[PDB]
Amino acid sequence: EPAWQTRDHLDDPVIGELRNRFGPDAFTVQATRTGVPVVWIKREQLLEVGDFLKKLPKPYVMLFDLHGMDERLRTHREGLPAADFSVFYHLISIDRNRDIMLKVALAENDLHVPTFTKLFPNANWYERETWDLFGITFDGHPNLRRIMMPQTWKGHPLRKDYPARATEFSPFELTKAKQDLEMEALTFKPEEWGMKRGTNEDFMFLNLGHGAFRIVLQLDGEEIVDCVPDIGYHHRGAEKMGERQSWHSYIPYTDRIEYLGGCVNEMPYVLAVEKLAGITVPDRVNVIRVMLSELFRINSHLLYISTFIQDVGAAFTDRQKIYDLVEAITGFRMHPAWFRIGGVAHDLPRGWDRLLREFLDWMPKRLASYEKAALQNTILKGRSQGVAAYGAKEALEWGTTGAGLRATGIDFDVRKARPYSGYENFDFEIPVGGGVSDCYTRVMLKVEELRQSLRILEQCLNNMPEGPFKADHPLTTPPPKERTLQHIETLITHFLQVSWGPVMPANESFQMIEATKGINSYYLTSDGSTMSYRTRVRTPSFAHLQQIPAAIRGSLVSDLIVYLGSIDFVMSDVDR
Amino acid sequence: ATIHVDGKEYEVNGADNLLEACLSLGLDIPYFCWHPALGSVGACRQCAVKQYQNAEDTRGRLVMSCMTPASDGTFISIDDEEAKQFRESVVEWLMTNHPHDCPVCEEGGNCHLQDMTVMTGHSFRRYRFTKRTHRNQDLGPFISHEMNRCIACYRCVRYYKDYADGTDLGVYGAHDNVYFGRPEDGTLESEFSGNLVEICPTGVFTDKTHSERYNRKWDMQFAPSICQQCSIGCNISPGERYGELRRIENRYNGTVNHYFLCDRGRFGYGYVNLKDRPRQPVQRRGDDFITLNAEQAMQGAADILRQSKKVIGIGSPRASVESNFALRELVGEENFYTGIAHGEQERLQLALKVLREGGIYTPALREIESYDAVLVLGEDVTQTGARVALAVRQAVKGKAREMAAAQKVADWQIAAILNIGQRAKHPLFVTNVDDTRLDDIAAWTYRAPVEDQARLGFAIAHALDNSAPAVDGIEPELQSKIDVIVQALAGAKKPLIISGTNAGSLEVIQAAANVAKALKGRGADVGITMIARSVNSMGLGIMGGGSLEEALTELETGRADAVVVLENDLHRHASAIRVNAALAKAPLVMVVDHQRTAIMENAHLVLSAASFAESDGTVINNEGRAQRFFQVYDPAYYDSKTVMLESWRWLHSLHSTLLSREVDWTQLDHVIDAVVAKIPELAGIKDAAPDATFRIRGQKLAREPHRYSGRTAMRANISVHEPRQPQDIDTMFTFSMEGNNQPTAHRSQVPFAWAPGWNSPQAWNKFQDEVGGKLRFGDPGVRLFETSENGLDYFTSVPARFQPQDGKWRIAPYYHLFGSDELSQRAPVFQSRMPQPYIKLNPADAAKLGVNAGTRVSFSYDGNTVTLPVEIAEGLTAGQVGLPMGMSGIAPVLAGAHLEDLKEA
């Protein structure tokens, strides 16, 4: 019974609880390769089901994801309710270490769902993105406006009838948008942003400028009364591109989401595609992927910590050494594009042991230097403690994952809770904080994660398995190159995989991983074709950016700047 | 019948085999030797499934799904482990000898062997020994041969020999050195040899014409179009790349031309890529040829047309219905002339009157295969309507099919059927001026002049029905053969009468109508087929107009001082001296054409019209079926200065500029609405294809596959800035990948067949309701007219017998599949395949002239002395001289004409 098998999860106790509560005919269980019980709920029972799951003895406390899907061109929907569109809700029980996906089927003429914001406040931005990209209205939403596209945008780009490729450039629309930027402040209505009490004659409205983004600030003097972060300035159409590229040729796009991560961003996508293909990778592939993911985690953590130290007023050679090793292994520093379906693009180069040994023997003195510069610095400690602090309740209700969630004391790491890529064969600790997640605790947790990633790299170096760097599956893409260049059937397989694409049988797969800034997940729907029917990417920085108004309510602008530096986020991760 | 595949219950046809039943249900079973059109033979052993004796059976047995009836209560498994292992083993055995050739193989990305290799999941070679090799043969200009890539699936020989009745392809040798080819190098002689490139699942037989300018199937931009090279109207998928027409694939149509084209349609597209085509409007002022853009071409043309007293228009059977109608609206109904001669127009409207007023059902091309007796009167079907000849061969094999059905042999078990029906066949009687290519299967062939062919038809009609007019002067031996024909036709449940306009004789069409009416009066299920000359001969006949002689008279008398010639060279329908003199007399000649013709020297204005690859339109079949063709590519995407518009667009904007002094580049649906409003007989062309607002769940239909490559590079040498995607306002297709080509989409127009896991022409299985049947949501195209309630009367104009008169030589028409049709004989690959210009003579007449075979004789027709070398024709009759119609200098209006001063040069 492999890990990629299609299961309906009828033995999950949440299915029996839902059956005993709402009756056996109130929902439809779908068998998937997501590893999660997927149930189809009536629209009229969605809030009741969400409230019931919120009040279980080990409750489902986190809205992990919420998005839509255009089901109109989907030809393999056997055992599925009739739908033109659908909305899915991914909910996580942390005490249970379980999750459930709820699906609401919608007809094309009635695209409205009850708002989920009364149960989970992060549903606000998730529903704004679903409205923006699919045109699905959420009744009761306070400010249901566009969040990726500008407000003067026609059409919903993630619909199947929307043309993906770039339209013709018009200078006149550019001058019109520049004009709209000219007196945006003069024609600023604080009703189009969800704000209130616009000019008491003491409230000031400003715009501001990890990526560049705007946030409108309502200030009473220097105190923040409300704020609305304006995002979507870095929207690259990555999911729509997932429908326009083959399963193989989408991998560089996985790189450029969360561009400080690289192979870390490759990992959930190729793991989900291997679930769709039914591929179990060999152990050497697992250790190679873990080693590259931990090298890039170290690189991203070092950049984040070095940026935080400089911003407060309390770094390049280490990242250069990591980039040199990654450049030797993959041929590229920043966007390696090196993981593959079934394995990795090449074997490890001869001499990788020497470079990794030189990196690991040179790092612990730098680790002591960073711990002295951060944990033992009083100016950093007095600047960073207590500013924008939240507890477990606020991290659970806002979908906060990564260092902030563990700083609240919730011991939730994906590598330990739901292991992937052979992470269960490594000995490493998960650092957690007290009950308070402020800037100092988050940065301290990132430093401890740096130490643990160095331990994982030491274990990767010490016993690196000998074996194949690609799986023996027929759907390993591409095949091994020497057999491609020598053998006719391997040439045939390579020819068809790199041109039309590999045929993934119709299914749905899911994979969440512990990325450098939180939990990154790929949710892939295959319609039996050589491209993805739906590529949904859940990124931590979207959810972390949504939590900003609920954490610096009543703080100062300098506190907001420190909070922005303390959040490990990048804007490409937010907007994707 | 009820079958259970992998425990899932399905309802199928019990008369089918399990392979076709399971492919029709959407299941995937790999296969090589089976084809929907050829039947099942059980050769390749690829299609193995596991059959169980009942539901409570676990052992099972590997059976061949193509050789197993899908009977009631069947239990099979496709996903059985032993069946999957065996299918992977069969792919492995084919892979042991297969050459390492995929990059340099024209079948790559379009190869069925690649697809079934991947589908079985075989990607690991454990064979370490040598591969057998083979020398290749030269199969002529169209088909390239690579015997290394063969898998010995026997599809080629079964198609070419048991289906198309070709004689020069076969299997040779033995155990694992089995060779598939000709007995020696030379051109493949079948008129339908080009279907090998889609029948062969590998790259053995490949399109040599495509191989010259090769590109892969993902790089092709396809559109659904209609073949323009004769009247049969076979659906095609032209595909282009880099602004040139690359390939013609067969487009499946279960009502017309299901899997097969003829070689003329498949390989005669090369005129589209000629470098002398007009690409811009060009105005002749003195000796200068000023290039214009579209707007000032319309302005100058409208000024000269406004200042002229009478403007006449000359259409063409090449042009679509929309172009001819737009010319008819520009010049008026009373000033519009069809571009064909008076005799051709008389024969065409007589065939139209027979088809839509004779009360006899005219069959589609696919339905021809189900008739029980065939009488072909005057039509060289293999050289003029070739796909009808292939359907006639299927109708002939119908007798063996019935004989095997009488012994309870299943209809897919083709080898048993052919063994039971050894040489028995349904009756075929062909009649021509000489021997035809249908004579191998014909029960009788009549070689005679067209008067005697008509008299034989009239005599058959009189012998079937005594109310038909009698023929006086029939010899006793010819009378005995007439009674043979009459006993065969009267004894058939479904007799079919084929004739056409190519014989050059009105009386032949009248005799065919008499035979069909006589059979209808006896209660038979008789059908009648009329083969026209060109792609839109029937549409031009339905629209109607004056003859070309009347237009030439209007030009010569000076009553018309402006002539707009649409897609017509005018030399195939009238004498070149008269045409040139009449056009030189006119002070304004405007030629709207996509080919460089001879009359463009006299033309004051030349409009660069679009051919079928660059235009949309509607053409009418020889059976009255209205079919839409769609534009394949935008000609201005690569060359920005090319002004190559549709002919209806040119003429509509010219009419707008003539009336209101403003141009109007209209839309196609507006022109079609104008046609159906103004000509009620052409009202059915609205339903041929849906309008440009048609969507599949909101999106358009994609012209190119989803993996189409080179988007930011194919034009980068011209400019690095990617141009705007060319907009299509005329049709529901988009000029990009951003559209729909799903097999389950509710549409009838499929630009190309592709499904995941099926990259070959076998992907047409996914687009059909059942394999080899119709398209899932109906075949495209609509019949314009229904069968009349009442028929015609008998034609009492029985001609006299042919009398050879001294000094005069009756011209007997000889049609060639390569050479007679104008546009295809302009194609450069046809020149090697084209016969040399040979004038045919009886041995008696050649001995009378003192002329041997090969010596050149000169004759004067219409004051033009031309010289050709002599071929001796045994089957011709004395007093007749045989000429190749449609060749260079021999216009097809010479059929039935007489010749003077035939003497040795």
Added chain:
Amino acid sequence: DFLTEAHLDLPMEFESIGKAGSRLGTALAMAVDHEINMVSLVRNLEEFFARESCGWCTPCRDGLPWSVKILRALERGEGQPGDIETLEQLCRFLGPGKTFCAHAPGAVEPLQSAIKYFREEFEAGIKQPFSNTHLINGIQPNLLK
């Protein structure tokens, strides 16, 4: 199929020889002495059967020559691991019903019985490590386990 000395007491009937894992056939038995190597005898048999294929159907036409080449390698001592398993798979997949006629099951009956009884000669043929790939200079091979 080949039979051993213990089967020599069987009455020459269809049912008795069929029950022993062979068939009566033409009932014209051929005796094999100890000086005859079974790999050479089966190589000769399969050479006949492969060159007497009619070429119609894939398994006989294309898998009997594979058995011939494996047997030639084993006869020359150039056998490689997986050869006996390939022969057994060829025997299983050329049985009754898999091929168009009965030529190929009759072909694989002696190979079946010779591997069943005299397997030691066939394993004595295997002397080389398995290889069908040569090294390509700039490409590290996928070292399968």
Added chain:
Amino acid sequence: EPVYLPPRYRGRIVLTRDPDGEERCVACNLCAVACPVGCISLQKAETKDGRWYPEFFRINFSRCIFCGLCEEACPTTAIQLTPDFEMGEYKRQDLVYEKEDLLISGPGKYPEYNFYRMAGMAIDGKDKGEAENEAKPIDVKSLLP
């Protein structure tokens, strides 16, 4: 100092030559379709002896993301990403590299692979039966059974 680059570095793209000196590319178009950006455009041409080669080969380097998917997709190792990164330009049109800007005079990173030594299709210097692991063509009229 010059910047050190590892041999795997994904920089400027070149087209290489086989060890006999002929250009490796057979214009099979696998690199163009495997390009996610779609910045490769080429056309197949053929010599008198039947050898496939690119008539033109152009790469839009203003579009190329140097991902190496084409080199991975190349079945002849013709297209290769090389350790060079100094490709800055004054005009964006000059970033379209034709075949005269890509075809270097050597084998690049894969020094010995010749695809035409593997292909069954015959060219000059290699008739039928001269590829690797290929038997000579037995004529169908041969006297041997």
